[PDB]
């Protein structure tokens, strides 16, 4: 999974935040594209930018009227992949000033 | 005139807490879908200070 | 009347509607202000006049 978009159109007509995790790096913005079909894989008024199995990465989203908020964890689980039961806890990341109204979102795979 | 200052007049919904919006969609008023109709029923929203 | 000599016609112990009014292209012109036409419907006065 590349990233993510956020946003109330999620291409054209008004502001709508992209997130890649592209490899080394994540990379931010909140002008629209119309990229989805395929960026896993070898074989505009932008008025905001920013830069920074056995695997169970968790995350939460959140927008707290004001800014655009990330927690995350990193944690090691057997290859029972549906969520074991061992109790976690996600520690923040960012708090973007970003300011979009946003009600639908969507996954780049 | 300083034209080149804008606000908008009127929203369907106030904003949020810091929620940032330049949308330039028709604002409606009345019965009829937009669609360009401007003036009554339907109006353009970034009025100006001039 | 002769705008010159305008009348005053009195309205008064009454309930008003304004929505009738603003949802209506009844009138070869129709404008309201100071308000939106939705806020209208929330007035009280001690008299109405045209
Ligand atoms: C973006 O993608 C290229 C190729 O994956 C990579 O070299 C680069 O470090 C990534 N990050 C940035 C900020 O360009
Ligand atoms: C940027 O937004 C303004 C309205 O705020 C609009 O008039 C203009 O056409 C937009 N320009 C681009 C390149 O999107």
């Known amino acids: 999974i590349r990233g993510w978009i ?40 932008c008025t ?26 990193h944690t090691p689980i057997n290859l029972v992949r549906g969520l074991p039961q061992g109790f976690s806890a996600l520690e923040p990341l960012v708090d973007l000033p970003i300011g979009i109204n946003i009600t639908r979102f969507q996954t780049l795979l | 005139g300083n034209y ?37 029923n339907c109006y353009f929203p970034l009025q100006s200070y001039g | 009347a002769s705008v010159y000599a305008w ?9 008003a509607d304004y929505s009738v ?9 129709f404008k309201c202000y100071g308000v939106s036409p939705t806020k209208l419907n929330d007035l009280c006065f001690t008299n109405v006049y045209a």
């Open chain 3, 21 to 29: 009014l603003y949802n209506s292209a009844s009138f070869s012109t």
């Open chain 1, 6 to 45: 956020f946003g109330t159109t999620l291409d054209s007509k008004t502001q709508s935040l992209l997130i890649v995790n592209n490899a080394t790096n994540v990379v931010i913005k909140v002008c629209e594209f119309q990229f989805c079909n395929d960026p896993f894989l070898g074989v505009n008024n």
């Open chain 3, 7 to 15: 009348n005053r016609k009195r309205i008064s112990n009454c309930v």
């Open chain 1, 48 to 73: 905001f930018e920013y830069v920074s199995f056995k695997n169970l990465r968790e995350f939460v989203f959140k927008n707290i009227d004001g800014y655009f908020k990330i927690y995350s964890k």
């Open chain 2, 4 to 40: 080149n200052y804008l606000y908008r007049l009127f929203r369907k919904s106030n904003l949020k807490p810091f929620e940032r919006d330049i949308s330039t969609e028709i604002y409606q008023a009345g019965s009829t879908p937009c669609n360009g109709v401007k003036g009554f």
